[PDB]
Specification:
homodimer, 304 residues, alpha+beta, Heat Shock Protein 90, three-stranded antiparallel beta sheet, globular, binds adenosine-5'-diphosphate, binds 2-OXO-4-methylpentanoic acid, binds potassium ion, binds magnesium ion, protein serine/threonine kinase activity (chains A, B)
């Protein structure tokens, strides 16, 4: 999958981009439909799963019904369709979580659901990146070409999600750990924010929850979460280290399972890992039981 | 393999211990000999490998020639033999490193040498622990039963090796990183020091070297190495985190190979990992290229 960095004045690059998207979306949607068609019958019969299955069929129908893009007029209407579909599918992760929660227990092969979700969610991420990139090409935001930030600061985007997670945490516990950021705090490079926008708040919420729940006696005084940025020519590494007591030995093999939670659907970790690996990186956990957890997010730098 | 914690007044436990050792050593030595007999011919013909092979045969001969232990008089002489053998074999790791260094290049299957060394070095560690434990049973050291410390402080033993590594480092570079220790600094529990005595200085030397070599402009002012102790009911975790620049992507798949070094034989990491895993734990590396490395040593608590 490619994100067109091309720019032009007649607006021809918008046409080429739209034509590529028009070519690409139906194919990738068809792959998701095949995934639904191959789900174990008893899972596929779940009304929420069926609802999502039908959304995808409906998406494929609308996309294939759209005439080949001939001019900017057509391209403009196609963008309307894509916006509609993006919105129609915005709750898909949540619907799948819900539909699978109970139903998947009716199945011996637990590998199956994991594979279906990894494949379905990462293909969806890719689909949404492509579509959103095309739409964003019409925008005149500085330092962006579509959804590509030409000079992303890891520190800045981390801070954005830190403020977000801290507010959620303060609402629930009356306080939140402070976050310190160190390492390559001045790094700036071309990068696509979207996956960080998913992953970072998931990891931050986990770290803050763990910290508060292990400090119930001193909610007014909890250990900082410490984030380290390492930027090299190959990848970006973001280490998130907390003193929230660690992931217990008895839970460790379970925490990367969809649905597993000690508490919201238990999707944060497996989804984040699937996204990271889909993009050529990884997500690794180091548990110091009794002390805390280090989470390492790695993402490959831009292929230009 | 079992370390007899039994104690008695007639000195009968020394007899039982000796009889067990007399039973156990020849068998385990015979296994090492089989390992030499199965080495690729061209490696087995290396004169240094042949020398080590012959040492093991000679060990097996002496052990099997020793009459069955009947009384404390016999047990005492057996201890003399064991002391001799421990001393005769003290340079074995170094001889194997040397004999294998070139010779192993004459071999397609690089898996072979790794397996031979993992197996040979860990079996040897076990053999030396057992023998040294028996000898130590004659000692009256407080807080020890043989080589088992009844109340080991991880902080204390870490500090011992910190002082050791720092002196080596200062000798070579004119300075050494300071080391801070945090987490469960007051932990005390029954534990066998011997494996830590191998592993800790290896990891500390790596961390200090990396730190000095990445700070050649400011040898008088280098970042601390930070060690975190986590003690729980399952394992002991010792995390050693440095700011020495990390292990490069191009080296990462090689650093756990025997002989691989960027500089002394390149044995520190693979040996430490083999020892940790032999004892039911592990050794894991997290590289933040451009920033530093976290090394996680885990060792299972005592099985009583
Ligand atoms: N930093 C952490 N410290 C301690 N436990 C954690 C941490 N991160 C995740 N976990 C554990 O992993 C489980 C799975 O996390 P996740 O997939 O994000 O789902 P959720 O947060 O919805 O439970 C959590 O319920 C929690 O028990
Ligand atoms: N903490 C560290 N930081 C950077 N590089 C490291 C670190 N630890 C190990 N290495 C790399 O791994 C290689 C292998 O280490 P090791 O097996 O201990 O052998 P040696 O120290 O003899 O080279 C080292 O040469 C070094 O390049
Ligand atoms: C292009 C849309 C159908 C978006 C999509 O695939 C999804 O979010 O599920
Ligand atoms: C008992 C000894 C022979 C010691 C040993 O096996 C060794 O160190 O190689
Ligand atoms: K989970
Ligand atoms: K090595
Ligand atoms: Mg979560
Ligand atoms: Mg070393």
């Amino acid at each position: 999958m490619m994100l067109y960095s091309g720019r032009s004045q007649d607006g021809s690059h918008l046409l080429k981009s739209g034509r590529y998207l028009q070519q690409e979306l139906p194919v990738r949607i068809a792959h998701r439909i095949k995934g639904f068609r191959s789900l174990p019958f008893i899972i596929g019969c779940n009304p929420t799963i069926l609802h999502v299955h039908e959304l995808y069929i409906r998406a494929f129908q609308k996309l294939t019904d759209f005439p080949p893009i001939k001019d900017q007029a057509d391209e403009a209407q196609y963008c309307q369709l894509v916006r509609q579909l993006l919105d129609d599918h915005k709750d898909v992760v949540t619907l799948l979580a819900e539909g699978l929660r109970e139903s998947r227990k009716h199945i011996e092969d637990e590998k199956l659901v994991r594979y279906f979700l990894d494949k379905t969610l990462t293909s969806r991420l890719g689909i949404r990146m492509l579509a959103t990139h095309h739409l964003a090409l019409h925008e005149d935001k500085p330092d962006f070409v579509g959804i590509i930030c030409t000079r992303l600061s890891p520190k800045k985007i981390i801070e954005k999600w830190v403020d977000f997670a801290r507010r959620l945490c303060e609402h629930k516990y009356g306080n939140a750990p402070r976050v310190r950021i160190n390492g390559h705090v001045a790094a700036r490079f071309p990068f696509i924010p979207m996956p960080l926008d998913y992953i970072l708040p998931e990891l931050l919420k986990n770290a803050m929850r763990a910290t508060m729940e292990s400090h119930l006696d001193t909610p007014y005084n909890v250990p900082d979460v410490v984030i380290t940025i390492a930027n090299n020519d190959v990848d970006l590494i973001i280490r998130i280290s907390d003193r929230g007591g660690g992931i217990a030995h008895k839970d460790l093999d379970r925490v990367m399972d969809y649905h597993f939670t000690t508490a919201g659907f238990g999707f944060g970790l497996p989804t984040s890992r699937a996204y990271a690996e889909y993009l050529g990186g990884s997500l690794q956990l180091q548990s110091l039981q009794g002390i805390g957890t280090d989470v390492y997010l790695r993402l490959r730098h831009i292929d230009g």
